[model samples]
Target chain A: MSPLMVKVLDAVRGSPAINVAVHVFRKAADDTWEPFASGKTSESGELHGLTTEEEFVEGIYKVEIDTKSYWKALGISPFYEHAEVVFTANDSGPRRYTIAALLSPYSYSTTAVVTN
Target chain B: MSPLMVKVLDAVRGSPAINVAVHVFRKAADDTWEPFASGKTSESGELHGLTTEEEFVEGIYKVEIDTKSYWKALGISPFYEHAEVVFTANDSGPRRYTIAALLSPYSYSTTAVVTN
Candidate 1:
């Protein structure tokens, strides 16, 4: 098992969303979402210390970025309150899966990938 | 020519984003964006009194919603500052096109369609 990682970038100007908060969630058997992890991005906009491959299970996962809180600190009205990426993780895939967000104050996009 | 209609709806509760301000823009030859129309949504979250079908031309167009100011009036920290849709219209398409937005304080989605 590998690690699940995330990165965020500014959509318009292509800069890192440095020191932003990123939250993780997992869907449970009862269809409820449970909090998994909460961490902040590095100066390069990458998140680390997530569940490693040995601890990861095949399930539905979600990553939500704290867009509103981050933008508010900057004195800008945030266009996106939260940016989310929802995807299914399976054991058949590689050990590592990466989720990334390209974000602007008003718009955002997310993508997921498997890494060696 | 049919009219270009626009509507906005709430994302979480599926309600109308009533009384919100929406702006339209047209892309110019030099790739500059020029404002074309500014209107407020009705109680039903629809905008009217735009260019009629006969007056419409094939071009790149954009619509922007003022999300920050609207949520601010409600004393809520807005998640999304604005919501926008950009699309191209061509002569081969139908005369009428409808563009709609599904919005939440933090997120939004837009769609365009041909009517008749």
Candidate 2:
């Protein structure tokens, strides 16, 4: 089983990305993507329990953030709509992975770290 | 040379997609995209003069709309960030193509028409 987690941050204000929509997808055998899980960021900008260990598989994965709704809800003008993160999960690594996203009106960055 | 124009519309309100950022890109030989032109929609939600006939070529083209900013400025929450439209341009027909985008916080659609 593989587990995934995510945290969203606002770079401009140095705060958590609160109430942002998050979606998870996995690449299928036919090269099409299938939605696996979805949720929203908490007050601390964290989203957990995306996929259980039994349901997780090694493959190409993508996470999409609704930055447009987040910024708009805060009455801020957004420069882009979706912030997407793509990565690979393999059996060689630990059984857990955590993705972090830094977002702003004009820019975004994502990083992933593996855990045992 | 091929000429391209675009109009943005709001699907929910059935209004013009006003004051949205529009960008144009052309696919290069190396398969990388090259940015060619950019502009904002007019009061009528139209963007013209994207590329002139002399600069237009036969290949793949993409247009991206910054829907996040438009919704944020209107004090509305947005569900997505970037809306992309991709199409092909060939020399067999008239040298002009017009693309129209119908957009909302939840969904988007695009259509292209060729003209002489």
Candidate 3:
């Protein structure tokens, strides 16, 4: 219900990924990712308030999910160091964007949905 | 790279899912889904030839992946009965469609990509 949000689903458990760490980054002029914000998911598997409408301007950005730690807590080994969803935000305008991810031990998928 | 294709990636192994069964269906007059074609993914984790340009018309279709068995073979009990990706095909024209699914034991994500 915010300008920027991340929804993560645990594929194995068919539930929301709770307490998964999420980091937001914006691309710098040198093309390096600069950390913008960081948060963790709620019990519902969503992290909100990463940015405001005025803050999340048009820019290349990435959301990195700490998948390895989430799995490690469950006593499992994961494949990715972190699941990163890189995209250009607010291309058309200041819109609401959701980065929905499905995560498991070995793989994950990220789909970006935008709305007015 | 065909008119329709399904690509499956195994989240656990971080590799293309091989030998996974896939089924394609088209909605019938009464809204019941009717089977159209079926195939298994290749070593590259893709299943083509589910439909041809002429056969894949403008209609509601669904691609179902046998997820439970895929996990069972590896001695893991999974959550979902099957992972299904349902959508309308060839809406704007005869476009190339790819259903990419990231699969794990407990959950999966399906993203539809259309190309001209």
Candidate 4:
């Protein structure tokens, strides 16, 4: 598994949120969000390689999901423009992280698991 | 079980987030957030009766969590000032909602399960 990964599920349909866009960013010293990697979920709703050990260094990171356009495509208007999962990474030590997000038309949930 | 419920867990320690504050609001016609109910999690990390069927009518709702203070008590700094799970409720018909929030110092995930 990649050092960083993402899994998304659809709450309304009780299945994986396939093909949703997932973007990762790392905050720079200048406090700007530089894009790290971007990809779409697979058929199983999991995506790896967003970051690797060589480059997934210590920093504050954000995982942004294009939630609005996704729900709009499903004919449901959502409240938020997008969903963001931001966290400090590799601070204590080199660790692996997995972000699991559950989505509904009107809401979404983001959970993270970090392990050394 | 109450019409509206909340469960909070501590992701770092792999346990329930006991006694954390949870506040709920209903969107009013005047574009204000009217306080509907408030409570704290029990030892099981679940809270019932924050709302009842008679009062949890059709509207938009927000579950605000004091994540900052919770982390602060444990000698840590968190990312967001608070965590919010916002969603539309009772639009199609009366329903039950359980907002399950998984929390770490730097990240949190709020997922909702709605049922008839």
The best candidate in terms of TM-score:
3
Candidate 2's DockQ = 0.03
i-RMSD per candidate, Å? 9.0, 12.7, 2.0, 4.5
lDDT leader? 3
- Candidate 3 is scored at a TM of 0.67
Which residue pairs clash in candidate 1? A1-A53, A2-A53, A78-B81, A79-B80, A79-B81, A81-B79, A81-B106, B11-B103
Winner on TM-score between 2 and 3 is 3
Error of 1 at A60 (Å): 8.5
**What is the C-alpha local distance difference test score of each model?**
0.77, 0.75, 0.84, 0.77
Give residue B58's error in model 3 in angstroms: 12
Tens-digit lDDT track for model 3 on B7-115?
9988777789888999999998999999988999999999978878778888999899998777787777876659787888756764998899877776667888877
Segments in model 3 whose C-alpha atoms lie over 4 Å from true places: A29-32, A89-92, B1-9, B15-64, B83-102, B108-116
lDDT (tens digit, per residue) of candidate 2 on A37-94: 8999899999976788778878877677777788888888654456555556777868
lDDT of 4 by residue, A89-113 (tens): 7556547788888887656677677
Model 4 interface Cα RMSD in Å: 4.5
Backbone clash pairs for candidate 2 read: A1-A53, A81-B81, A82-B81, B1-B53
When 1 and 4 are scored with TM-score, the better candidate is: 4
Model 4 segments more than 4 A misplaced: A1-70, A76-107, A110-116
What is candidate 4's TM-score against the reference? 0.58
Clashing pairs in 3: A11-B106, A11-B107, A12-B106, A12-B107, A106-B11, A107-B11
Provide the lDDT at B57 for model 2: 75
Compared with the true structure, what per-residue lDDT tens digits does model 2 show for residues B1-116?
33888888987777898999998888899998799789999989998777787788787776777777898888876544565555567788677777777766645555566688
Against the true structure, what is every candidate's RMSD? 7.3, 15.5, 4.7, 6.6
Task: State how far residue B16 of model 4 sits from its true place (Å).
Answer: 0.7
DockQ of 1: 0.06
Q: What lDDT tens digits, residue by residue, belong to model 1 across residues B1-116?
A: 33688888764334687888888898999999988767888989888877775667889999898887766676656557897878887888777887888665655678887865
Q: Which DockQ value does candidate 4 get?
A: 0.17
